[PDB]
Amino acid sequence: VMTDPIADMLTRIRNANMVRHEKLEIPASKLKREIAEILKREGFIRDVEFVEDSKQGIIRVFLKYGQNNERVITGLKRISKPGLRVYAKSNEVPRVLNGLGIAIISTSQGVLTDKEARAKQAGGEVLAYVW
Amino acid sequence: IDPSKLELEERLVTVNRVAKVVKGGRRFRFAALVVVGDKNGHVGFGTGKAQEVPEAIRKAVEDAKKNLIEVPMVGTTIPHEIIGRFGAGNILLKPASEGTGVIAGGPVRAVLELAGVADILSKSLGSNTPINMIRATLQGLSELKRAEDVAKLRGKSVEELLG
Amino acid sequence: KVCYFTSNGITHIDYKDVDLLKKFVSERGKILPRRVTGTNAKYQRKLTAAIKRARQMALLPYVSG
RNA sequence: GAACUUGAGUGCAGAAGAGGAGAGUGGAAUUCCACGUGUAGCGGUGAAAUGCGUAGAGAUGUGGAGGAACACCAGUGGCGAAGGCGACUCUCUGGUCUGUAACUGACGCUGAGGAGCGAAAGCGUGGGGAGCGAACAGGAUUAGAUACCCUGGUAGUCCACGCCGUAAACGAUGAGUGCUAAGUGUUAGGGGGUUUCCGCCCCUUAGUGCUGCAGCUAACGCAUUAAGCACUCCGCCUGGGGAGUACGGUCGCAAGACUGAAACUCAAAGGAAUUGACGGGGGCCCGCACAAGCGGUGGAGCAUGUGGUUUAAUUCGAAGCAACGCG
Numbered sequence A: 001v002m003t004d005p006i007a008d009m010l011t012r013i014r015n016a017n018m019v020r021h022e023k024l025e026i027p028a029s030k031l032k033r034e035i036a037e038i039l040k041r042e043g044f045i046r047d048v049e050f051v052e053d054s055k056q057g058i059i060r061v062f063l064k065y066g067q068n069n070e071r072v073i074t075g076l077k078r079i080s081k082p083g084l085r086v087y088a089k090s091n092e093v094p095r096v097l098n099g100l101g102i103a104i105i106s107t108s109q110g111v112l113t114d115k116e117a118r119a120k121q122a123g124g125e126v127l128a129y130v131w
Numbered sequence B: 001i002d003p004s005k006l007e008l009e010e011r012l013v014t015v016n017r018v019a020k021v022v023k024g025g026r027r028f029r030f031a032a033l034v035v036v037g038d039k040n041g042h043v044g045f046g047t048g049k050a051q052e053v054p055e056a057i058r059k060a061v062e063d064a065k066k067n068l069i070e071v072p073m074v075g076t077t078i079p080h081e082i083i084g085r086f087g088a089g090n091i092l093l094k095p096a097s098e099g100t101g102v103i104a105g106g107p108v109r110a111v112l113e114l115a116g117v118a119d120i121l122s123k124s125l126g127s128n129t130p131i132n133m134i135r136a137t138l139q140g141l142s143e144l145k146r147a148e149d150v151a152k153l154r155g156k157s158v159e160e161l162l163g
Numbered sequence C: 001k002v003c004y005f006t007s008n009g010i011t012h013i014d015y016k017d018v019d020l021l022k023k024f025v026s027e028r029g030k031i032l033p034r035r036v037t038g039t040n041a042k043y044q045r046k047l048t049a050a051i052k053r054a055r056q057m058a059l060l061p062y063v064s065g
Numbered sequence D: 001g002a003a004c005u006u007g008a009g010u011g012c013a014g015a016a017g018a019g020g021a022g023a024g025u026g027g028a029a030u031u032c033c034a035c036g037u038g039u040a041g042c043g044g045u046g047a048a049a050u051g052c053g054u055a056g057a058g059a060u061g062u063g064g065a066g067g068a069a070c071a072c073c074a075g076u077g078g079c080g081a082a083g084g085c086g087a088c089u090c091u092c093u094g095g096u097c098u099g100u101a102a103c104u105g106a107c108g109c110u111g112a113g114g115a116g117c118g119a120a121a122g123c124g125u126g127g128g129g130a131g132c133g134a135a136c137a138g139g140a141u142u143a144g145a146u147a148c149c150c151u152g153g154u155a156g157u158c159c160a161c162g163c164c165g166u167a168a169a170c171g172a173u174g175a176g177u178g179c180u181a182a183g184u185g186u187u188a189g190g191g192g193g194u195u196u197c198c199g200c201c202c203c204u205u206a207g208u209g210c211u212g213c214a215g216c217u218a219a220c221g222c223a224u225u226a227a228g229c230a231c232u233c234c235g236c237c238u239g240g241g242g243a244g245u246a247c248g249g250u251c252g253c254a255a256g257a258c259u260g261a262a263a264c265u266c267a268a269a270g271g272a273a274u275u276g277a278c279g280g281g282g283g284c285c286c287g288c289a290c291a292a293g294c295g296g297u298g299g300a301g302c303a304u305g306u307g308g309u310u311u312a313a314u315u316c317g318a319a320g321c322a323a324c325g326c327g
Helices: A005-018 A030-041 A114-119 B053-066 B106-115 B130-141 B147-154 B158-162 C018-024 C041-056
Strands: A023-027 A045-051 A058-063 A076-078 A102-106 A111-113 A124-130 B009-022 B025-037 B042-050 B082-086 B089-095 B120-124
Touching: A005 A023, A005 A030, A005 A058, A005 A076, A005 A124, A023 A030, A030 A045, A030 A058, A030 A102, A030 A111, A030 A124, A102 A114, A111 A114, B009 B053, B009 B106, B009 B130, B025 B053, B025 B106, B025 B130, B042 B053, B042 B106, B042 B130, B082 B130, B089 B130, B106 B120, B106 B130, B147 B158, C018 C041
Parallel strands: none
Antiparallel strands: A023 A058, A045 A058, A076 A124, A102 A111, A102 A124, B009 B025, B025 B042, B082 B089, B089 B120
């Protein structure tokens, strides 16, 4: 059965990205929606729509490709998993691809990027890497 | 890439005597593997067969000159860590500090030194077959993203990227 | 070829209907294969049961001679 | 703690199926028994023989006995968790699939240990026994033939109960979930499109095949039935022998099963693919290759060369074709 919705959402993006799809639709949740919003703010995806319905909602994500159809998102990794959680100290918050990518940490301040969390001297669960 | 404009050094990585069996005996040939590079961010490899070693090496150089790639280089090192993977060849390439020098295995070193990378850590994590180690190294080097172009793709300034 | 039963709107094949059944057995009494008679898969199975019931009740022969 | 319905399940309406257990019934064929007709072999092999037959065989007609298996249908068809399940009828009974949104509202996934099931052989008790057939006997074959082949043939194969618990038990591929081009068959449904229909076409689920992108792989190949991309849980691997062995423990009537080493020993063992070579593999083609003919050699006397042996020396070299009237 479904065990890691966050991982599953990342995989939908990875798979859709791999075949240069324009858009994908992810079943929504509060945490998945926050991750999607970071990707837009950080310029990894084009746009994100939240469609309501009777069920839990759908996130339509529009992927972003440069000139020459180049994929902006090169890779996505799930770090914290249901089987092995990963929490980081404020000073041990990882940089991703030597600062060319981002890491998404869930903190008590909110769901931030690595840079944002570092400025607040906050740690927390390291959700994913994106580069 | 036009190799004429570039000043290309050539380095002989290996020469394996290979054999095709036929009636009566064995037809030996020599398979030279050569890397060439300008030492200023361009490097390529080629493979040439021939019955005599000099001719094998000549044919490798022409092949290598056809397949030059451009290796992104931040200062004297690579922009970020990468694991070059090709078949069982699996090379890890890490950026290093100034004055570290090139710390790499034999065939990997040829590629990096001819590419003109001065400071880099590497470690072969898979097969040490020269041809495949080189292919893995160049596959990995071909995946290096320069900070400037990433900013353009993501629609941000380099200041926002580095942070 | 087309299935005889779907064409004529035959929902229920019956082992009693000997005259109909006899169109599906060979000269020797062998049940003709579906590939040769064009019957639908579903109706071939129903038809096979009918012929076997008929042969049991002496409406059709097992071996003609 | 309170809600929600997608997961999961229930209700309601349909569908297919060699799913299982029990009890019956049917037709073909083999064997045996009785009888009629009928006469000299039948059977078997590469060739034979052993064997059966004038005491009437084999062949042929009628009837009867008994046991085992279910031609055609039949199909990379169906069903089952796997092993496995194929004549028909009835009794009992499990699961899956489709639609529906009436209901519950996370009730789910995996699962060490444990329990149950688990082809064939085998074992215990008692039945049954046609065909087949380990063992065994005889006839052949062979240098030998404790084999292949032939004629017989015991256990067994079958049934009831119990035990055994192993297979190349294989898709050599754990279970669950989601995501990621297409084309094309086929099985069981649903909806629709022109209709009495038939049908054609379109869509949709769930299985079952082939081809084939991306991706993966050492390669071969996999590819919406993944060996791709992910997440959860379980099992298992760490060079080849020694060895699935020894000791111990558990299980078993026994055979043995499960668990499971080390000393010692080697520097390999191995996977895929490539080039050739070979095959008592296949195809095609050619040659005094065979076939169709002619004349020889091997026998005799002698010439010559060689080997052996004898010599004081019997000079040296040549050894399948490709050395031997050769230097």
